[PDB]
């Protein structure tokens, strides 16, 4: 149903090694299209996917006089955050920016967000209403008050509801067989003996789109939750994903255990049992 | 497409 374009920004200060490091990345759902590196050769916004490859050069030059100026605003930011936190000049500090928009089943604006965090801890984020700010620090308020002055919340609102979605649609159409695709997992189950007396069942899910999935073990119908290990969804390579769940089973009891896969890409939830 | 108006804290 919903579709998201988000943007990701990174600025790590580096004392005695010149000007801070900058990394901007764009994402459509879970597909990457634009990336930037103030350390790489070309100094140009890079395409990755075919649907952005098609976009002409007036855009590229426009989004490299833009993202170099994005960097500049993030480079100055690092200094303000040292003044506010009362910190030492020689110190590797990380600032991060992420804005974005969503579009539902139909294709119109759903939700928006724009958020800053520094060193890892939360700083400031726009709420759901896009009318007020979340200031998650004792002295991140001093920034919040200023971000009402120039009606920053209101100006951003118009972007997220404006070109954010207008271009999101464009891209989605620029390559319909790249983004609007949905891939269902290729599921099976393996067996590992940890001893004569202990065993492991492992619910596989190979190459699927997008990320969102809910694997959970079942033991006699009941929600099995004790002897269960499960990893973070891992990116394969060819625009696909993988996730597995592990359960510890006593030597002999296998039939009792049935898997339960969830996804929007399969008719109804899939169940897996041991051979 | 990127964001056009930028703010400093």
């Amino acid at each position, epitope marked *: 149903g919903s579709h998201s374009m988000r943007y990701f920004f990174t600025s790590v200060s580096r004392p005695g090694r010149g000007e801070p490091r900058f990394i901007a990345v764009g994402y459509v759902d879970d597909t990457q299209f634009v990336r930037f590196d103030s350390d790489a050769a070309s100094q140009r916004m890079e395409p990755r996917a075919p649907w952005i490859e098609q976009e002409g050069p007036e855009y590229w030059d426009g989004e490299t006089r833009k993202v170099k*100026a994005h960097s500049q*605003t993030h480079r100055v930011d690092l200094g303000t955050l040292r003044g506010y936190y009362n910190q030492s000049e020689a110190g590797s500090h990380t600032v991060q920016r992420m804005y974005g928009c969503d579009v539902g089943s139909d294709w119109r604006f759903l939700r928006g967000y724009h958020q800053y965090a520094y060193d890892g801890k939360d700083y400031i984020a726009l709420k759901e209403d896009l009318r007020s700010w979340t200031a998650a620090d004792m002295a991140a308020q001093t920034t919040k008050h200023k971000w009402e002055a*120039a009606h920053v919340a209101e100006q951003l609102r118009a972007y997220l509801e404006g070109t954010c979605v207008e271009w999101l649609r464009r891209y989605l159409e620029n390559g319909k067989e790249t983004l609007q695709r949905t891939d269902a997992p290729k599921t099976h189950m393996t067996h590992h003996a940890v001893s004569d007396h202990e065993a492991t069942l492992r619910c596989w899910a190979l190459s699927f789109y997008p990320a969102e999935i809910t694997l959970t073990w079942q033991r006699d119908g009941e929600d099995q939750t004790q002897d269960t290990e499960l990893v973070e969804t891992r990116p394969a390579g060819d625009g696909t994903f993988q996730k597995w769940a592990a359960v510890v089973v006593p030597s002999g009891q296998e039939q009792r255990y049935t898997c339960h896969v969830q996804h929007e890409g399969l008719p109804k939830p899939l169940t897996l049992r041991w051979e | 497409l990127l964001l056009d108006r930028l703010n400093q804290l």
Partner: T-cell receptor
Framework: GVSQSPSNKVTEKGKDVELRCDPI?????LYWYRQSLGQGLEFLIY????????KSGLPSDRFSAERTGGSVSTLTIQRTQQEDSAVYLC????????????FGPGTRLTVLE | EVEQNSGPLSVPEGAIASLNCTYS??????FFWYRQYSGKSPELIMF????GDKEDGRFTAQLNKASQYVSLLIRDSQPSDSATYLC??????????FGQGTRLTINP
């Protein structure tokens, strides 16, 4: 508000001139513009902190502006050509992508021989 | 580039005066309207970020990204208005590029 120093300048061809524009206190962005009689507002160099992010758009190598010694800014034109007789405007900015820019009264420049 | 007709426009007092401006890069987002007098100094008075209808009393800046233009409507035009109106687009990311501007005269 803003103030550009001084009032005016009439000079002989071949002079150097520094131009002062004391900008609004607490503004981390400065733009240099030039416009006169016939001409419209023509851009020169925009600043940020103390780095010159965009230097392109200057008639000669005689043109070089710098803003490093604080917030206040300077514009240097060496060996004044007669072709640079114009009104030099300087405008600050609180943010970079903020609403209004604030122009000082500007400084008219005449290069006779 | 950002092109614009420069009149000059001459309007009677009371009548609505209308200023037009266009641009190239479709994906623009920042649109401003500065007003400068007799070689004084530009003073921003209208700015718009999204398509539609914004009003500062008399001023009525209208934007439309479709055809790639932006307008300005001054209802109840006073003689204290005659001055070069000035549209502006934000190029790259930060930097404001200008049109020649349109000279106005409000015949009293």
């Amino acid at each position: 508000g803003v103030s550009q120093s001084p009032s005016n300048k009439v000079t002989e061809k071949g002079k150097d001139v520094e131009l002062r524009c004391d900008p609004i206190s607490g503004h981390t962005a400065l733009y240099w513009y030039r416009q006169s009689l016939g001409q419209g507002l023509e851009f020169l160099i925009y600043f940020q902190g103390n780095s010159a992010p965009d230097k392109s758009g200057l008639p000669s190598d005689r043109f070089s502006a710098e803003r490093t010694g604080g917030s206040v800014s300077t514009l240097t034109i060496q060996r004044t050509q007669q072709e640079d007789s114009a009104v030099y405007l300087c405008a600050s900015s609180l943010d970079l992508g903020a609403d209004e820019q604030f122009f000082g009264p500007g400084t008219r420049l005449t290069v006779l021989e | 580039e950002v092109e614009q007709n420069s009149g000059p426009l001459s309007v009677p007092e009371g009548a609505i005066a209308s200023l037009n401006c266009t641009y190239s890069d479709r994906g623009s987002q920042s649109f401003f309207w500065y007003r400068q007098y007799s070689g004084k100094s530009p003073e921003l008075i209208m700015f718009i970020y999204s398509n539609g209808d914004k009003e500062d009393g008399r001023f009525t800046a209208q934007l439309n990204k479709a055809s790639q233009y932006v307008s300005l409507l001054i209802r109840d035009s006073q003689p204290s208005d005659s001055a070069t109106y000035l549209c502006a687009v934000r190029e790259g990311a930060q930097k404001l590029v200008f049109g020649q501007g349109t000279r106005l005269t409000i015949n009293p």
